[PDB]
Amino acid sequence: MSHEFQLATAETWPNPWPMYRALRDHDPVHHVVPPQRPEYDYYVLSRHADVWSAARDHQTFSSAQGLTVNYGELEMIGLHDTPPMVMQDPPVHTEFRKLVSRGFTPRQVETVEPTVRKFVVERLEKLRANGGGDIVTELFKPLPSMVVAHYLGVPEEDWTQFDGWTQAIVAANAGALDAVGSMMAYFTGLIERRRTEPADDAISHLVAAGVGADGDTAGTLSILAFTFTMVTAGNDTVTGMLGGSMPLLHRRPDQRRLLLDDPEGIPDAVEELLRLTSPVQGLARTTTRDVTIGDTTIPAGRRVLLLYGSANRDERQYGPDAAELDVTRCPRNILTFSHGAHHCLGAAAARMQCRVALTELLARCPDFEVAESRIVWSGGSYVRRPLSVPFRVT
Numbered sequence: 230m231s232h233e234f235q236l237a238t239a240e241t242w243p244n245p246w247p248m249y250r251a252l253r254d255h256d257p258v259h260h261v262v263p264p265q266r267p268e269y270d271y272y273v274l275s276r277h278a279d280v281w282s283a284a285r286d287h288q289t290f291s292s293a294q295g296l297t298v299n300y301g302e303l304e305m306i307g308l309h310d311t312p313p314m315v316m317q318d319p320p321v322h323t324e325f326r327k328l329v330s331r332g333f334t335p336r337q338v339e340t341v342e343p344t345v346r347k348f349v350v351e352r353l354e355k356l357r358a359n360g361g362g363d364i365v366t367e368l369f370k371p372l373p374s375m376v377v378a379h380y381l382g383v384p385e386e387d388w389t390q391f392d393g394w395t396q397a398i399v400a401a402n403a404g405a406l407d408a409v410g411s412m413m414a415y416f417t418g419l420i421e422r423r424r425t426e427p428a429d430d431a432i433s434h435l436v437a438a439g440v441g442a443d444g445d446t447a448g449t450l451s452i453l454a455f456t457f458t459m460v461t462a463g464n465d466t467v468t469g470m471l472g473g474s475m476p477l478l479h480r481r482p483d484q485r486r487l488l489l490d491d492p493e494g495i496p497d498a499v500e501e502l503l504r505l506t507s508p509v510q511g512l513a514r515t516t517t518r519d520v521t522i523g524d525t526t527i528p529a530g531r532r533v534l535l536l537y538g539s540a541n542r543d544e545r546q547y548g549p550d551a552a553e554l555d556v557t558r559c560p561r562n563i564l565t566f567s568h569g570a571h572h573c574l575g576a577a578a579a580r581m582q583c584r585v586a587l588t589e590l591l592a593r594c595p596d597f598e599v600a601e602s603r604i605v606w607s608g609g610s611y612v613r614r615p616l617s618v619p620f621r622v623t
């Protein structure tokens with residue numbers, strides 16, 4: 230047990246909630262001054278109201294210096310020259326987002342759903358036949374990779390090779406030189422193909438809109454950067470949502486009962502699971518001006534950690550039962566996908582995967598066991614996701 234603020238590790242991901250509660254109740258605008266590195270001080274926002282408003286306010290809370298509390302981030306990763314879309318502010322962010330958004334419509338979520346369902350069924354049946362097993366390795370890891378592949382217009386025949394690169398990158402993001410090289414090489418070819426054979430995906434749309442046309446190397450690089458953004462955005466997060474939901478469901482048979490009796494309640498249940506798992510538990514911003522929130526003034530030029538995971542658990546927004554699973558809650562203004570300019574492009578895709586996985590878990594493996602104490606969590610301070618979830622089926 231610890232109620233003192235610290236960036237999470239594999240060992241402290243099981244139960245960050247009391248720490249968050251202490252912040253919300255006693256220091257909602259919390260100044261962190263690392264004793265070993267006081268020059269790397271930063272601030273932490275834990276309440277729903279403050280996080281909601283800060284996420285929206287890109288003018289005051291910029292994404293352009295990076296999304297971690299590490300002040301050397303952009304040079305450390307090698308993206309200072311031209312940061313990716315998630316590290317762009319408007320207006321730079323706006324045009325590119327408009328173009329790629331053409332590949333994030335109901336059509337793209339709908340076309341991949343039968344493929345998602347088929348894979349979920351295949352893997353859950355294998356688990357059922359074997360009385361359980363490694364649900365993360367066999368389902369919750371590979372599934373989101375296929376969906377990201379779909380959104381990038383990777384042909385189905387290349388999904389296995391694409392999974393290989395994805396896993397190396399995801400593990401490293403939590404070097405991957407072979408993977409980064411293979412992927413950037415593969416997409417160079419695919420982008421070229423989309424010049425003459427455009428489909429309905431985000432890459433096809435970027436190419437059709439003339440990004441990279443007429444020797445615009447920088448444009449082409451932006452498409453390549455977007456592929457890396459997608460791999461890092463759409464994988465560990467979904468695995469976190471899926472794996473993180475398992476103990477929550479297991480320990481509430483009454484809540485499973487509600488959905489067994491009314492499967493049409495599953496979409497609402499997905500929102501509640503997204504609220505409580507909040508796979509992106511926090512991301513940072515940089516203040517562009519001094520800003521006062523209550524009795525605290527955050528100086529210009531400092532990182533501010535937006536604790537989405539805490540905002541999602543704030544009793545001021547969701548009541549004294551905010552810590553509990555209620556699949557009929559219908560929570561509004563969840564922070565799981567942030568809010569404002571950078572609102573997750575993959576929200577509908579993530580929701581669809583959760584819906585299909587939950588539907589089939591209840592239909593195919595209703596009697597299951599999860600030992601929460603034996604879950605292994607990934608390292609990394611921003612995304613909360615299991616590497617392994619003990620899973621037994623009777």
Ligand code: HEM
Nearest residue numbers: 314315462463466467470508509566567571573574575579
């Ligand atoms: C449950 C799973 C997911 C969670 C919790 C999640 C969370 C988020 C969050 C919090 C942001 C905003 C980042 C910020 O505040 O700076 C974001 C952005 C983004 N996400 Fe997701 N995401 C998920 C799944 C996905 C999927 C499946 C995809 C792709 C199909 C995706 C693609 C993106 C992209 C491209 C952005 C950048 C948007 C922009 O900066 O304008 N995400 N996501």
